[PDB]
Amino acid sequence: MVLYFIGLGLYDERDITVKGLEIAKKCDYVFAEFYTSLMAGTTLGRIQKLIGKEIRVLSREDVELNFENIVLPLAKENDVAFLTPGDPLVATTHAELRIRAKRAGVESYVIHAPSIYSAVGITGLHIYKFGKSATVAYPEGNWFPTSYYDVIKENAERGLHTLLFLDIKAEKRMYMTANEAMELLLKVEDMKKGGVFTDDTMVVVLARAGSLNPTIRAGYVKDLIREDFGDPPHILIVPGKLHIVEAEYLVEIAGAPREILRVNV
Amino acid sequence: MVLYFIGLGLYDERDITVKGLEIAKKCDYVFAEFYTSLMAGTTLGRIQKLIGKEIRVLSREDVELNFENIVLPLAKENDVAFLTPGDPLVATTHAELRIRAKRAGVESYVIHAPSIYSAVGITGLHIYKFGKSATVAYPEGNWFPTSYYDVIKENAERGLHTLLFLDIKAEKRMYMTANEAMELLLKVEDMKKGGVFTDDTMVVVLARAGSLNPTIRAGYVKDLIREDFGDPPHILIVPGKLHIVEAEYLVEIAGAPREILRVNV
Numbered sequence: 001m002v003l004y005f006i007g008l009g010l011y012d013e014r015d016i017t018v019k020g021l022e023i024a025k026k027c028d029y030v031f032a033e034f035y036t037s038l039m040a041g042t043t044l045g046r047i048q049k050l051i052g053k054e055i056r057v058l059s060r061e062d063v064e065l066n067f068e069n070i071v072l073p074l075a076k077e078n079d080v081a082f083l084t085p086g087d088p089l090v091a092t093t094h095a096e097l098r099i100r101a102k103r104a105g106v107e108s109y110v111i112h113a114p115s116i117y118s119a120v121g122i123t124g125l126h127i128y129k130f131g132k133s134a135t136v137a138y139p140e141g142n143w144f145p146t147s148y149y150d151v152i153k154e155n156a157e158r159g160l161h162t163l164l165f166l167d168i169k170a171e172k173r174m175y176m177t178a179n180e181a182m183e184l185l186l187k188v189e190d191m192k193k194g195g196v197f198t199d200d201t202m203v204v205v206l207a208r209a210g211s212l213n214p215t216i217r218a219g220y221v222k223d224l225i226r227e228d229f230g231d232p233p234h235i236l237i238v239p240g241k242l243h244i245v246e247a248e249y250l251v252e253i254a255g256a257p258r259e260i261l262r263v264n265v
Numbered sequence: 266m267v268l269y270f271i272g273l274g275l276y277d278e279r280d281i282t283v284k285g286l287e288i289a290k291k292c293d294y295v296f297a298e299f300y301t302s303l304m305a306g307t308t309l310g311r312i313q314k315l316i317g318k319e320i321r322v323l324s325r326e327d328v329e330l331n332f333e334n335i336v337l338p339l340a341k342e343n344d345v346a347f348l349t350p351g352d353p354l355v356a357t358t359h360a361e362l363r364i365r366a367k368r369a370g371v372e373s374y375v376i377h378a379p380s381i382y383s384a385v386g387i388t389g390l391h392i393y394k395f396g397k398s399a400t401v402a403y404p405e406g407n408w409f410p411t412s413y414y415d416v417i418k419e420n421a422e423r424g425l426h427t428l429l430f431l432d433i434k435a436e437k438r439m440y441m442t443a444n445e446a447m448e449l450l451l452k453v454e455d456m457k458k459g460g461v462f463t464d465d466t467m468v469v470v471l472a473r474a475g476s477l478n479p480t481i482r483a484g485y486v487k488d489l490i491r492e493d494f495g496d497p498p499h500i501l502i503v504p505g506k507l508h509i510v511e512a513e514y515l516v517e518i519a520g521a522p523r524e525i526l527r528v529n530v
């Protein structure tokens with residue numbers, strides 16, 4: 001008579017925690033969504049096989065409009081699991097689903113999993129130095145999103161790093177690359193000219209975190225905007241003022257230009 | 266010839282990922298540290314038993330001063346694992362360890378696990394809204410540090426939430442409670458008097474993140490400062506202005522007072 005929100009992790013079905021696996025294995029019904037993020041190293045079949053259950057994948061509409069109609073009803077007589085990439089409550093609106101669970105008289109539990117939010121640590125940038133986060137959204141029609149631009153400005157002014165979640169259009173199998181994010185930002189810059197994102201802006205790219213050989217690159221936009229970082233998902237980071245050890249890591253590990261060592265502090 | 270940085274997760278021995286467990290099991294030597302944080306929901310014996318490997322515990326000094334003499338040499342002819350609570354490389358000085366590894370001609374890989382940074386998503390607060398993070402440290406002798414107070418100030422001023430880690434003495438197994446941190450912040454407020462942290466300030470408390478039964482409480486300081494949040498470790502969060510959705514979650518899930526729906530939104 002309970003509902004479990006269980007994260008699947010960063011890259012493949014093995015990024016699920018042992019706790020999440022044990023529980024997922026003993027659930028009567030298992031649902032899931034693969035629109036909030038992309039797990040580039042696995043397939044539904046592999047996940048199903050690992051857990052030993054058939055998985056009913058739900059779409060955004062099913063979830064946002066009919067969660068209480070498709071999932072909750074079952075969480076009354078059986079134990080139900082709802083799986084998601086990464087951590088279920090990070091950079092999603094899934095937290096509100098717990099309210100629906102409650103209002104429906106259903107107990108819910110959350111099993112965390114490695115998230116891109118903490119995986120930034122592999123970039124060598126101190127995680128406590130990150131400021132407000134943002135999402136680079138694909139423009140659609142005449143509507144051209146720009147708010148993410150100001151987040152960077154506000155953080156950079158405070159010497160804080162900016163984590164940039166990149167857009168997703170799962171139904172169309174479209175995953176924004178760091179390259180596309182950089183192009184969009186240059187356009188916003190050219191429009192606002194606030195000094196925030198230019199060819200000389202040093203950025204960090206993390207691609208396919210959770211895999212054994214993710215792509216970790218750092219450098220100036222002008223040099224990275226056309227570089228091939230491999231398949232999605234990707235995240236773009238605009239570092240603020242760097243500590244010396246951060247610069248050393250970005251250089252020795254992320255192939256950054258030695259001149260960034262000059263923190264110019 | 267390989268070094269594995271493997272995350273142990275949040276609370277107990279099942280918080281490690283499936284990938285992390287399998288890789289550890291195939292390693293010839295297994296090290297771990299519990300000075301940055303502790304796995305309050307388990308024990309070394311249970312971790313050793315689950316992994317089925319002998320685990321050598323390293324002190325802060327063993328790591329910071331002698332990592333290249335204790336861990337790296339064994340990684341030249343064997344597969345070695347280095348276990349840390351949470352997600353690897355989150356602790357400020359751990360990234361630099363990969364640099365030490367490279368310098369010694371040792372390949373290193375990162376196996377992620379849940380981190381409090383992402384786990385706090387269970388509080389209902391939107392992750393993108395967190396600003397700079399800080400640690401509340403106890404004063405000592407003539408040293409009265411208060412920077413964490415300024416972090417809260419700068420963040421809140423911009424509508425951002427502040428994640429506050431509470432001081433800990435690993436060796437002594439002595440944690441700072443949420444109640445203690447609040448008293449300290451009130452003392453710092455009485456000194457700086459910046460109208461940042463008062464009896465009227467609204468805060469969130471998270472304890473035992475990772476366990477199936479964590480403690481998530483929200484409310485005003487004057488009602489929570491003497492409340493019992495359970496066994497450590499505790500995490501304190503000073504939210505900035507709330508999105509109505511965030512407040513509804515704190516009210517419905519964290520037992521927050523209806524009052525926040527109008528006062529802090």
Ligand SMILES: Nc1ncnc2c1ncn2[C@@H]1O[C@H](CSCC[C@H](N)C(=O)O)[C@@H](O)[C@H]1O
Pocket residue numbers: 010011036037038085086087088089090091092114115116117164165166167168206207208209210233234235383
């Ligand atoms: N393994 C990975 N590597 C790089 N970026 C990733 C990633 N997983 C997620 N992201 C980034 O985050 C976006 C999804 S946002 C949802 C995040 C998820 N709940 C988590 O906890 O990680 C992607 O479009 C991408 O920009």
Ligand code: NA
Pocket residue numbers: 127128130131382395396397398
């Ligand atoms: Na953060």
